[PDB]
Amino acid sequence: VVGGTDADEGEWPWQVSLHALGQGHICGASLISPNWLVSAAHCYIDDRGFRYSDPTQWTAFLGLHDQSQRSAPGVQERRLKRIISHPFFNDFTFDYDIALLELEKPAEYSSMVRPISLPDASHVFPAGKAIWVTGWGHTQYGGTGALILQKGEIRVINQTTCENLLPQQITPRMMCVGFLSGGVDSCQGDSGGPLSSVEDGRIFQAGVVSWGDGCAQRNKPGVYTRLPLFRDWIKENTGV
């Protein structure tokens, strides 16, 4: 996250960190039940010969605050049973950039480990709404990840504006969120993490960090997968 600030301990207890064998933190995810996470398909594609699609080469950290303190109180470490990539995911366009990760053993809910509510298929996040992005991604384009979980408040962008700003690249599965003046944005390593929409104190996951043209540039807001469209796919494949 570029332009954000340190999250408080326990503040985003649905945020998960996904580590790939021998590489440290690579992507984010969100807890939606004791057994299931939501993440980005593109994180789990074989590439450069490393087998990112191999569920046995991932470790999920739940309840994590600081990447240098992975044995801290409240952290739950889990292996993955399987990765369900969306069948329409396209690795050239990044259309349908979503995946479901099954934990080997269930999480135990705690002050630091809690699920986030799914939106039903009719749920709207209108252009202009302020929502939150979190992750351990880079804090500058071309920089390094954050040890402490970062948070940033960003705004939903109009879909026509989004299309014109990133021409020939936006599909209806995608939403632009950020600021047209840049400054606050997700970045490499935030992929797969949640957009958290805070209302009356109810919180919904609005989308999934997917991609961007650089990070925090003017007129180049981050691009996110829209979660309401996938409610029935999640139910069908996980029961959640």
Ligand X SMILES: CC(C)(C)NC(=O)NC1CCN(C(=O)[C@H](Cc2cccc(C(=N)N)c2)NS(=O)(=O)c2cccc(-c3ccc(CO)c(F)c3)c2)CC1
- What residues act catalytically? 42, 97, 191
Span from 7-15, 123-131, 154-162, 181-189 in contact with ligand X (CB under 6 A): 181-189
Helix (H) or strand (E) segment spanning residue 77: strand 76-85
Span from 3-11, 15-23, 78-86, 179-187 in contact with ligand X (CB under 6 A): 179-187
Q: Which is nearer to ligand X, 20 or 187 (CB)?
A: 187
Q: Which is nearer to ligand X, 76 or 225 (CB)?
A: 225
Task: Enumerate residues 186-215 that contact ligand X by CB under 6 A.
Answer: 186-188, 190-191, 209, 211-215
| Helix/strand/coil percent split, the chain, to 5 | 10, 35, 55
Task: Enumerate residues 119-158 that contact ligand X by CB under 6 A.
Answer: none
Provide φ and ψ at 90, rounded to 5°: -120, 120
Breaks (C-N over 2.5 A) in the chain follow: 199
Q: Least distance in Å: CB of 72 to ligand X?
A: 26
Residue pair 151/5 in contact (Cβ under 8 Å)? The answer is: yes
Q: Least distance in Å: CB of 33 to ligand X?
A: 25
Q: Least distance in Å: CB of 109 to ligand X?
A: 28
Task: Enumerate residues 55-94 that contact ligand X by CB under 6 A.
Answer: 91, 93-94
Q: Least distance in Å: CB of 195 to ligand X?
A: 11
**Two structure tokens written together for 204:** 């919904």
Q: Considering only CA atoms, which of 99, 88, 91, 93 is closest in space to residue 166?
A: 93
Q: What angle do CA 226, 229, 233 make, to 5 degrees?
A: 120
Q: Which residue is nearest to ligand X (CB)?
A: 212
Q: Is 225 in the site for ligand X (CB under 6 A)?
A: no
Question: Distance of CA 112 to CAs 10, 15, 80, 109, 214, Å?
Answer: 5, 10, 20, 8, 32
Q: Which residues bind ligand X (CB under 6 A)?
A: 42, 45, 47, 91, 93-94, 169, 185-188, 190-191, 209, 211-215, 222
